[PDB]
Amino acid sequence: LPLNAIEPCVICQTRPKNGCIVHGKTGHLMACFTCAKKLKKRNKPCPVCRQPIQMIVLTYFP
Amino acid sequence: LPLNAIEPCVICQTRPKNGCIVHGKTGHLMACFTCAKKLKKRNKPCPVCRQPIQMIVLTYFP
Ligand SMILES: [Cl-]
Ligand SMILES: [Cl-]
Ligand SMILES: [Cl-]
Ligand SMILES: [Zn+2]
Ligand SMILES: [Zn+2]
Ligand SMILES: [Zn+2]
Ligand SMILES: [Zn+2]
């Protein structure tokens, strides 16, 4: 089970990990929506795998 | 912060929550990839919001 999912965004260290960086059928979830959207807007790659960012998904945990 | 992110798949109660159900620019992450992919294969809606499932994203937590 992913025990690190409850830690804050690794970029701003303030908001929760709710900005999923999607590339193909995988995603890296380590940033908040705010931070992740700035990377997409700036045409930056995924911070952990450097693949292109297809979209940011605002991720809820029901 | 999403303290329920580290609980198991609400469907199979055995695998981790790594199957993000994506609809538009939002996602609900409460199931594993295995369970979520069965819903997408059967064209079932999102279990919590009933929107159509565009894709399942295999979600990693770096
Ligand atoms: Cl945010
Ligand atoms: Cl986007
Ligand atoms: Cl899919
Ligand atoms: Zn952030
Ligand atoms: Zn990535
Ligand atoms: Zn499951
Ligand atoms: Zn949903």
Residue numbers in the entry:
A (entry chain DDD), B (entry chain AAA): 430 to 491
From the paper:
Second, it promotes the proteasomal degradation of p53 by recruiting Ub conjugating enzyme (E2) thioesterified with ubiquitin (E2~Ub; ~ indicates thioester bond) via its RING domain and mediates ubiquitin (Ub) transfer from E2 to p53,8 where Ub is preferentially conjugated to lysine residues located in the C-terminal lysine rich region of p53.9 Although the relative importance of these mechanisms is context dependent, in vivo mouse studies with ligase defective MDM2 resulted in the same lethality as MDM2 knockout experiments. The RING domain of MDM2 has been discussed as an alternative target to stabilize p53.19 The rationale for this approach lies in MDM2′s ability to still bind and inhibit p53 when MDM2-mediated ubiquitination is abolished, thereby preventing uncontrolled activation of p53.8 The RING domain gains its E3 ligase activity through dimerization with either itself or the RING domain of its catalytic inactive homologue MDMX to form a homodimer or heterodimer, respectively.
Since the G443T substitution produced a stable MDM2h dimer, we wanted to understand its impact on MDM2h’s structure and function. We purified MDM2hGT on a large scale with the aim to crystallize it in complex with UbcH5B–Ub. The structure of MDM2hGT and the orientation of UbcH5B–Ub are indistinguishable from the structure of wild-type MDM2h bound to UbcH5B–Ub, indicating that the point mutation did not affect the ability of the RING domain to recruit UbcH5B–Ub. Based on these observations, the G443T substitution impacts neither the RING domain fold nor UbcH5B–Ub binding. Consequently, the autoubiquitination activity of MDM2hGT is comparable to the wild-type MDM2h (Figure 5d and (e)).
